[PDB]
Protein backbone atom coordinates (compact mmCIF):
# COMPACT_ATOMS: atom_id res chain seq x y z
CA UNK A 1 0.00 0.00 0.00
CA UNK A 2 2.75 2.46 -0.88
CA UNK A 3 4.00 4.76 -3.62
CA UNK A 4 7.34 6.47 -4.18
CA UNK A 5 7.59 9.41 -6.57
CA UNK A 6 10.95 9.02 -8.30
CA UNK A 7 12.93 10.67 -11.09
CA UNK A 8 12.53 9.13 -14.54
CA UNK A 9 16.03 7.70 -14.40
CA UNK A 10 15.74 6.58 -10.77
CA UNK A 11 12.56 4.76 -11.83
CA UNK A 12 14.45 2.94 -14.60
CA UNK A 13 17.00 1.77 -12.03
CA UNK A 14 14.27 0.77 -9.56
CA UNK A 15 12.66 -1.51 -12.16
CA UNK A 16 16.03 -3.16 -12.78
CA UNK A 17 15.81 -4.51 -9.23
CA UNK A 18 15.17 -8.27 -8.92
CA UNK A 19 12.08 -7.22 -6.91
CA UNK A 20 10.55 -5.88 -10.15
CA UNK A 21 11.29 -8.86 -12.37
CA UNK A 22 7.58 -9.67 -12.10
CA UNK A 23 4.48 -8.85 -14.17
CA UNK A 24 3.80 -5.10 -14.11
CA UNK A 25 0.78 -2.79 -14.36
CA UNK A 26 1.30 0.56 -16.04
CA UNK A 27 -0.69 3.37 -14.37
CA UNK A 28 -1.27 7.09 -14.87
CA UNK A 29 -2.93 9.73 -12.68
CA UNK A 30 -3.57 12.70 -14.98
CA UNK A 31 -4.42 16.09 -13.52
CA UNK A 32 -4.70 19.42 -15.32
CA UNK A 33 -1.50 20.69 -13.72
CA UNK A 34 0.63 17.53 -13.73
CA UNK A 35 0.48 13.75 -14.25
CA UNK A 36 2.10 10.90 -12.32
CA UNK A 37 2.91 7.74 -14.29
CA UNK A 38 4.62 4.47 -13.47
CA UNK A 39 4.37 0.82 -12.59
CA UNK A 40 2.83 -1.36 -9.86
CA UNK A 41 3.86 -4.84 -8.70
CA UNK A 42 2.98 -7.60 -6.24
CA UNK A 43 1.32 -9.78 -0.20
CA UNK A 44 2.60 -6.31 -1.06
CA UNK A 45 1.22 -3.75 -3.54
CA UNK A 46 4.11 -1.50 -4.47
CA UNK A 47 4.15 1.39 -6.94
CA UNK A 48 6.85 3.74 -8.18
CA UNK A 49 5.93 6.55 -10.54
CA UNK A 50 7.50 9.64 -12.04
CA UNK A 51 5.92 13.05 -12.65
CA UNK A 52 5.36 15.07 -15.81
CA UNK A 53 4.16 18.63 -16.24
CA UNK A 54 1.03 19.23 -18.29
CA UNK A 55 2.77 22.40 -19.49
CA UNK A 56 0.88 22.65 -22.77
CA UNK A 57 -2.41 21.85 -20.98
CA UNK A 58 -3.23 19.48 -23.83
CA UNK A 59 -4.38 15.95 -23.00
CA UNK A 60 -2.56 14.64 -26.11
CA UNK A 61 0.82 15.38 -24.45
CA UNK A 62 0.45 12.12 -22.54
CA UNK A 63 1.44 10.30 -25.73
CA UNK A 64 4.89 11.93 -25.69
CA UNK A 65 5.35 10.91 -22.04
CA UNK A 66 4.36 7.32 -22.87
CA UNK A 67 6.81 7.21 -25.79
CA UNK A 68 9.64 8.66 -23.69
CA UNK A 69 9.04 6.02 -21.03
CA UNK A 70 9.14 3.21 -23.61
CA UNK A 71 12.36 4.75 -24.95
CA UNK A 72 14.14 5.18 -21.61
CA UNK A 73 13.28 1.59 -20.60
CA UNK A 74 14.72 -1.88 -21.42
CA UNK A 75 12.56 -4.36 -23.36
CA UNK A 76 12.97 -6.79 -20.45
CA UNK A 77 11.06 -4.25 -18.36
CA UNK A 78 8.42 -3.27 -20.94
CA UNK A 79 7.71 -6.91 -21.91
CA UNK A 80 6.49 -7.47 -18.34
CA UNK A 81 3.57 -5.03 -18.71
CA UNK A 82 0.34 -7.03 -18.39
CA UNK A 83 -2.12 -4.11 -18.00
CA UNK A 84 -2.28 -0.37 -18.57
CA UNK A 85 -4.80 1.94 -16.89
CA UNK A 86 -4.88 5.74 -16.63
CA UNK A 87 -7.36 8.23 -15.21
CA UNK A 88 -8.30 11.68 -16.55
CA UNK A 89 -10.23 14.60 -15.02
CA UNK A 90 -13.36 14.41 -17.21
CA UNK A 91 -16.20 12.12 -18.38
CA UNK A 92 -15.02 9.02 -20.28
CA UNK A 93 -16.99 6.79 -22.67
CA UNK A 94 -16.40 3.15 -23.60
CA UNK A 95 -13.43 3.18 -21.25
CA UNK A 96 -11.59 4.49 -24.30
CA UNK A 97 -12.54 8.10 -25.06
CA UNK A 98 -11.95 10.78 -22.46
CA UNK A 99 -13.08 14.39 -22.45
CA UNK A 100 -13.70 17.13 -23.32
CA UNK A 101 -12.18 18.58 -20.17
CA UNK A 102 -12.57 22.10 -18.77
CA UNK A 103 -8.96 22.30 -17.56
CA UNK A 104 -7.40 20.85 -20.69
CA UNK A 105 -7.95 20.81 -24.42
CA UNK A 106 -8.06 17.67 -26.55
CA UNK A 107 -9.48 14.16 -26.29
CA UNK A 108 -7.92 11.17 -24.54
CA UNK A 109 -7.96 8.34 -27.09
CA UNK A 110 -6.93 4.84 -26.01
CA UNK A 111 -6.64 3.74 -29.66
CA UNK A 112 -3.77 6.25 -30.05
CA UNK A 113 -1.85 4.91 -27.06
CA UNK A 114 1.29 2.74 -27.35
CA UNK A 115 0.43 -0.90 -26.77
CA UNK A 116 3.70 -1.74 -25.05
CA UNK A 117 2.20 0.13 -22.08
CA UNK A 118 -1.45 -0.47 -22.99
CA UNK A 119 -1.80 -4.16 -23.91
CA UNK A 120 -4.90 -4.84 -26.04
CA UNK A 121 -7.79 -6.27 -24.02
CA UNK A 122 -5.99 -5.31 -20.80
CA UNK A 123 -6.17 -1.52 -20.86
CA UNK A 124 -8.60 1.24 -19.94
CA UNK A 125 -9.05 4.99 -19.55
CA UNK A 126 -10.98 5.91 -16.38
CA UNK A 127 -12.69 9.03 -15.13
CA UNK A 128 -10.73 10.38 -12.14
CA UNK A 129 -13.43 9.56 -9.57
CA UNK A 130 -13.96 6.17 -11.26
CA UNK A 131 -10.31 5.51 -10.48
CA UNK A 132 -10.87 6.97 -7.01
CA UNK A 133 -13.71 4.54 -6.30
CA UNK A 134 -11.52 1.63 -7.35
CA UNK A 135 -8.98 3.14 -4.96
CA UNK A 136 -11.48 3.00 -2.10
CA UNK A 137 -12.06 -0.68 -2.88
CA UNK A 138 -8.29 -1.24 -2.88
CA UNK A 139 -7.94 0.29 0.60
CA UNK A 140 -10.80 -1.83 1.92
CA UNK A 141 -9.31 -5.00 0.43
CA UNK A 142 -5.95 -4.18 1.99
CA UNK A 143 -7.72 -4.27 5.40
CA UNK A 144 -6.57 -0.73 6.05
CA UNK A 145 -9.88 1.20 5.83
CA UNK A 146 -9.86 2.58 9.38
CA UNK A 147 -6.35 3.97 8.80
CA UNK A 148 -7.50 6.22 5.97
CA UNK A 149 -11.19 6.76 6.64
CA UNK A 150 -12.89 8.24 9.70
CA UNK A 151 -16.57 7.97 10.59
CA UNK A 152 -18.35 11.35 10.65
CA UNK A 153 -21.57 9.67 11.72
CA UNK A 154 -22.97 6.14 11.53
CA UNK A 155 -26.22 5.65 9.66
CA UNK A 156 -29.23 3.59 10.55
CA UNK A 157 -28.52 0.84 8.00
CA UNK A 158 -24.89 -0.04 8.78
CA UNK A 159 -25.42 -2.41 11.71
CA UNK A 160 -28.18 -4.30 9.92
CA UNK A 161 -26.12 -4.88 6.75
CA UNK A 162 -22.70 -5.21 8.42
CA UNK A 163 -21.08 -7.01 11.33
CA UNK A 164 -17.79 -5.10 11.28
CA UNK A 165 -17.59 -1.63 12.91
CA UNK A 166 -18.44 1.35 10.67
CA UNK A 167 -15.30 2.69 8.99
CA UNK A 168 -13.41 -0.60 9.19
CA UNK A 169 -14.42 -1.89 5.74
CA UNK A 170 -16.24 -0.40 2.75
CA UNK A 171 -19.29 -2.53 3.48
CA UNK A 172 -21.36 -4.83 1.28
CA UNK A 173 -23.57 -1.98 0.14
CA UNK A 174 -23.35 0.96 -2.22
CA UNK A 175 -20.71 3.57 -1.49
CA UNK A 176 -21.10 7.05 -2.98
CA UNK A 177 -17.70 8.68 -3.34
CA UNK A 178 -17.62 12.48 -3.36
CA UNK A 179 -14.48 14.59 -3.90
CA UNK A 180 -15.12 18.29 -3.29
CA UNK A 181 -11.95 19.81 -4.67
CA UNK A 182 -11.15 21.82 -7.78
CA UNK A 183 -14.08 20.19 -9.53
CA UNK A 184 -16.77 18.31 -7.62
CA UNK A 185 -16.27 14.63 -8.39
CA UNK A 186 -18.65 11.75 -7.82
CA UNK A 187 -18.78 8.02 -8.42
CA UNK A 188 -20.95 5.22 -7.06
CA UNK A 189 -19.38 1.98 -5.99
CA UNK A 190 -22.40 -0.19 -6.66
CA UNK A 191 -22.73 -3.46 -4.78
CA UNK A 192 -24.40 -6.38 -6.57
CA UNK A 193 -25.90 -8.58 -3.83
CA UNK A 194 -26.44 -11.39 -6.35
CA UNK A 195 -22.75 -12.05 -7.09
CA UNK A 196 -21.49 -10.10 -4.06
CA UNK A 197 -19.32 -7.93 -6.36
CA UNK A 198 -18.59 -4.19 -6.36
CA UNK A 199 -18.55 -2.20 -9.60
CA UNK A 200 -17.67 1.47 -10.00
CA UNK A 201 -20.27 3.63 -11.72
CA UNK A 202 -18.98 7.05 -12.85
CA UNK A 203 -21.33 9.99 -12.13
CA UNK A 204 -21.54 13.70 -12.88
CA UNK A 205 -23.55 14.77 -9.82
CA UNK A 206 -21.82 18.16 -9.64
CA UNK A 207 -23.44 19.32 -12.88
CA UNK A 208 -27.04 18.77 -11.73
CA UNK A 209 -29.15 21.90 -11.14
CA UNK A 210 -29.33 22.69 -7.39
CA UNK A 211 -32.82 22.11 -6.00
CA UNK A 212 -33.83 24.66 -3.38
CA UNK A 213 -34.54 24.57 0.31
CA UNK A 214 -35.10 28.01 1.86
CA UNK A 215 -32.39 29.72 -0.16
CA UNK A 216 -33.99 31.11 -3.34
CA UNK A 217 -32.34 34.53 -2.77
CA UNK A 218 -28.86 33.07 -2.35
CA UNK A 219 -29.24 30.90 -5.47
CA UNK A 220 -30.64 33.77 -7.56
CA UNK A 221 -27.72 35.90 -6.36
CA UNK A 222 -25.27 33.37 -7.80
CA UNK A 223 -27.47 32.84 -10.88
CA UNK A 224 -27.31 36.58 -11.62
CA UNK A 225 -23.53 36.53 -11.26
CA UNK A 226 -22.89 33.36 -13.33
CA UNK A 227 -25.59 33.95 -15.96
CA UNK A 228 -26.34 30.24 -15.46
CA UNK A 229 -28.75 28.33 -13.21
CA UNK A 230 -26.46 27.17 -10.39
CA UNK A 231 -25.40 23.54 -10.23
CA UNK A 232 -23.87 21.89 -7.17
CA UNK A 233 -20.35 22.43 -8.43
CA UNK A 234 -21.01 26.18 -8.66
CA UNK A 235 -21.57 26.17 -4.87
CA UNK A 236 -19.18 23.36 -3.99
CA UNK A 237 -15.81 24.28 -5.53
CA UNK A 238 -12.99 26.81 -5.11
CA UNK A 239 -14.98 29.39 -7.05
CA UNK A 240 -17.97 28.44 -4.91
CA UNK A 241 -16.05 28.99 -1.67
CA UNK A 242 -14.86 32.41 -2.92
CA UNK A 243 -18.48 33.25 -3.66
CA UNK A 244 -19.62 32.23 -0.17
CA UNK A 245 -16.94 34.39 1.49
CA UNK A 246 -17.76 37.52 -0.54
CA UNK A 247 -21.42 37.11 0.36
CA UNK A 248 -20.49 36.87 4.05
CA UNK A 249 -18.19 39.91 4.27
CA UNK A 250 -20.34 42.11 1.98
CA UNK A 251 -17.25 44.11 1.00
CA UNK A 252 -16.05 44.82 4.54
CA UNK A 253 -12.88 42.83 3.83
CA UNK A 254 -10.94 42.20 0.61
CA UNK A 255 -11.86 39.14 -1.56
CA UNK A 256 -9.68 36.08 -0.86
CA UNK A 257 -8.86 32.87 -2.75
CA UNK A 258 -10.15 29.42 -1.80
CA UNK A 259 -6.83 28.23 -0.34
CA UNK A 260 -6.58 31.50 1.61
CA UNK A 261 -10.22 31.26 2.81
CA UNK A 262 -9.57 27.73 4.04
CA UNK A 263 -6.32 28.80 5.70
CA UNK A 264 -8.03 31.71 7.49
CA UNK A 265 -10.84 29.41 8.63
CA UNK A 266 -8.27 27.06 10.20
CA UNK A 267 -6.77 30.07 11.98
CA UNK A 268 -10.20 30.69 13.49
CA UNK A 269 -11.54 33.59 11.44
CA UNK A 270 -15.33 33.91 11.76
CA UNK A 271 -15.89 35.21 8.22
CA UNK A 272 -13.91 32.36 6.65
CA UNK A 273 -15.51 29.84 9.03
CA UNK A 274 -18.97 31.05 7.97
CA UNK A 275 -17.83 30.61 4.37
CA UNK A 276 -16.80 26.98 4.96
CA UNK A 277 -20.13 26.19 6.62
CA UNK A 278 -22.06 27.61 3.65
CA UNK A 279 -19.94 25.50 1.29
CA UNK A 280 -20.62 22.37 3.32
CA UNK A 281 -24.34 23.17 3.53
CA UNK A 282 -24.41 22.70 -0.26
CA UNK A 283 -22.11 19.66 -0.16
CA UNK A 284 -24.57 18.07 2.26
CA UNK A 285 -27.39 18.86 -0.16
CA UNK A 286 -25.59 16.83 -2.83
CA UNK A 287 -25.53 14.10 -0.22
CA UNK A 288 -29.15 14.29 0.91
CA UNK A 289 -30.51 14.24 -2.66
CA UNK A 290 -28.12 11.50 -3.78
CA UNK A 291 -28.90 9.57 -0.58
CA UNK A 292 -32.44 9.34 -1.87
CA UNK A 293 -31.70 8.82 -5.58
CA UNK A 294 -28.99 6.21 -5.19
CA UNK A 295 -29.83 4.61 -1.81
CA UNK A 296 -26.21 4.26 -0.65
CA UNK A 297 -25.02 2.43 2.47
CA UNK A 298 -22.14 4.86 2.79
CA UNK A 299 -20.99 8.25 1.52
CA UNK A 300 -17.24 8.90 1.65
CA UNK A 301 -15.63 12.32 1.27
CA UNK A 302 -12.22 12.00 -0.43
CA UNK A 303 -9.31 14.14 -1.63
CA UNK A 304 -6.23 15.93 -0.28
CA UNK A 305 -8.12 19.00 0.86
CA UNK A 306 -10.57 16.81 2.80
CA UNK A 307 -7.52 15.59 4.74
CA UNK A 308 -5.85 19.03 5.01
CA UNK A 309 -9.11 20.50 6.30
CA UNK A 310 -9.66 17.85 8.97
CA UNK A 311 -9.88 20.76 11.42
CA UNK A 312 -13.30 21.66 10.04
CA UNK A 313 -14.74 18.15 10.46
CA UNK A 314 -13.29 17.56 13.93
CA UNK A 315 -15.22 20.57 15.24
CA UNK A 316 -18.30 18.97 16.89
CA UNK A 317 -20.41 22.06 16.12
CA UNK A 318 -19.67 21.97 12.39
CA UNK A 319 -20.25 18.22 12.39
CA UNK A 320 -23.65 18.67 14.03
CA UNK A 321 -24.53 21.35 11.48
CA UNK A 322 -23.47 19.18 8.55
CA UNK A 323 -25.43 16.25 9.96
CA UNK A 324 -28.51 18.44 10.25
CA UNK A 325 -28.12 19.54 6.64
CA UNK A 326 -27.52 15.97 5.42
CA UNK A 327 -30.95 15.13 6.87
CA UNK A 328 -32.58 18.26 5.41
CA UNK A 329 -34.81 16.45 2.89
CA UNK A 330 -38.51 15.70 2.77
CA UNK A 331 -37.86 11.97 2.54
CA UNK A 332 -36.12 12.05 5.92
CA UNK A 333 -39.64 11.81 7.38
CA UNK A 334 -39.21 8.15 6.37
CA UNK A 335 -35.58 8.00 7.52
CA UNK A 336 -33.95 7.79 4.09
CA UNK A 337 -31.13 10.25 4.74
CA UNK A 338 -30.60 8.74 8.22
CA UNK A 339 -29.84 5.35 6.69
CA UNK A 340 -26.50 6.54 5.36
CA UNK A 341 -23.09 6.38 7.04
CA UNK A 342 -20.88 9.36 6.30
CA UNK A 343 -17.09 8.98 6.38
CA UNK A 344 -14.15 11.24 5.50
CA UNK A 345 -10.62 10.58 4.31
CA UNK A 346 -8.38 11.42 7.28
CA UNK A 347 -4.96 10.43 5.91
CA UNK A 348 -3.31 11.34 2.59
CA UNK A 349 -3.35 8.68 -0.14
CA UNK A 350 -3.41 8.66 -3.93
CA UNK A 351 -6.65 6.74 -4.40
CA UNK A 352 -6.49 7.29 -8.16
CA UNK A 353 -3.18 5.47 -8.69
CA UNK A 354 -4.29 2.63 -6.43
CA UNK A 355 -7.58 2.62 -8.38
CA UNK A 356 -5.87 2.38 -11.77
CA UNK A 357 -3.99 -0.63 -10.47
CA UNK A 358 -7.05 -2.31 -9.00
CA UNK A 359 -9.07 -1.72 -12.16
CA UNK A 360 -6.20 -3.39 -13.96
CA UNK A 361 -6.73 -6.47 -11.79
CA UNK A 362 -10.33 -6.86 -12.97
CA UNK A 363 -9.00 -6.75 -16.53
CA UNK A 364 -5.90 -8.95 -16.62
Ligand X SMILES: O=C(N[C@@H]1[C@@H](O)[C@H](O)[C@@H](CO)O[C@H]1O)OCC1=Cc2ccccc2S1(=O)=O
- Which residues on neighbouring strands pair with residue 38, listed in sequence order? 27, 49
Does 177 engage in binding with a second copy (CB under 8 A)? no
CA dist., res. 47 & res. 138, Å (int): 13
Phi, psi torsion values for 264, nearest 5 degrees: -55, -45
* 50, 87, 123, 127: residue in contact with ligand X (rule CB under 6 A): 127
C-alpha dist (Å) from residue 152 to 149, 221, 298: 9, 31, 11
Kindly state the smallest distance separating residue 231's Cβ from ligand X, in Å. 8
Half-sphere exposure in the Cβ direction for 270 (13 Å, CA): 1
* 17, 23, 334, 347: residue in contact with ligand X (rule CB under 6 A): 334
190 with 199: CB under 8 angstroms?
A: yes
Known binding residue 192? Answer is: no
Coil, helix or strand at residue 198: strand
* 66, 101, 149, 232: residue in contact with ligand X (rule CB under 6 A): 101
319 binds, among ligand X, a second copy, none (CB under 5 to 8 A by kind): none
* 182, 231, 309, 352: residue in contact with a second copy (rule CB under 8 A): 231
CA dist., res. 311 & res. 304, Å (int): 13
CA dist., res. 207 & res. 196, Å (int): 31
94 binds, among a second copy, ligand X, none (CB under 5 to 8 A by kind): a second copy
Does 199 engage in binding with a second copy (CB under 8 A)? yes
Convert 260-270 to b/e letters by CB count within 10 Å (16 or more is b): ebbebbbeebe
* 2, 76, 102, 220: residue in contact with ligand X (rule CB under 6 A): 102
Q: Which of 230, 237, 290 is nearest to 103 (CA)?
A: 237
Residues 196-225 that bind ligand X (CB under 6 A): 204, 206-207
Q: Which of the 8 DSSP states describes residue 6?
A: -
Stretch of residues binding a second copy (CB under 8 A), selected from 14-22, 224-232, 260-268, 272-280: 224-232
Does 335 engage in binding with ligand X (CB under 6 A)? no
Known binding residue 33? Answer is: no
Known binding residue 309? Answer is: yes
**Residues composing the chain:** 364
- Between 50 and 157, CB nearer to a second copy: 157
Which residues make up each annotated binding site for ADP? 182, 305, 309
- Interacting residues toward a second copy by CB under 8 A: 91, 93-96, 100, 124, 157, 161, 172-173, 188, 190, 192-195, 199, 201-205, 207-213, 216, 228-229, 231, 289, 292-295, 329-331, 334, 336, 359, 362-363
Amino acid sequence: MNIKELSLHELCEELKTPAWNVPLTFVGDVGGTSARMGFVREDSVHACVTRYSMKRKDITELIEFFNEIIELMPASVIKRVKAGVINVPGPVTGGAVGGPFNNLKGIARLSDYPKALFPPGRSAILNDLEAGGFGVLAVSDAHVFSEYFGVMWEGTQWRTCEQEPAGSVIGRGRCLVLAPGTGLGSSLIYYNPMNQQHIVVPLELGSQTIPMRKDIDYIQTLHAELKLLPNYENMVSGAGLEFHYRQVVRGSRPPCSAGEIAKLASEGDANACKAMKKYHEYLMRVGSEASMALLPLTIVLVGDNIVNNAFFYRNPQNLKEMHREALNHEMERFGFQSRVTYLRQKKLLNLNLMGCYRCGLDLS
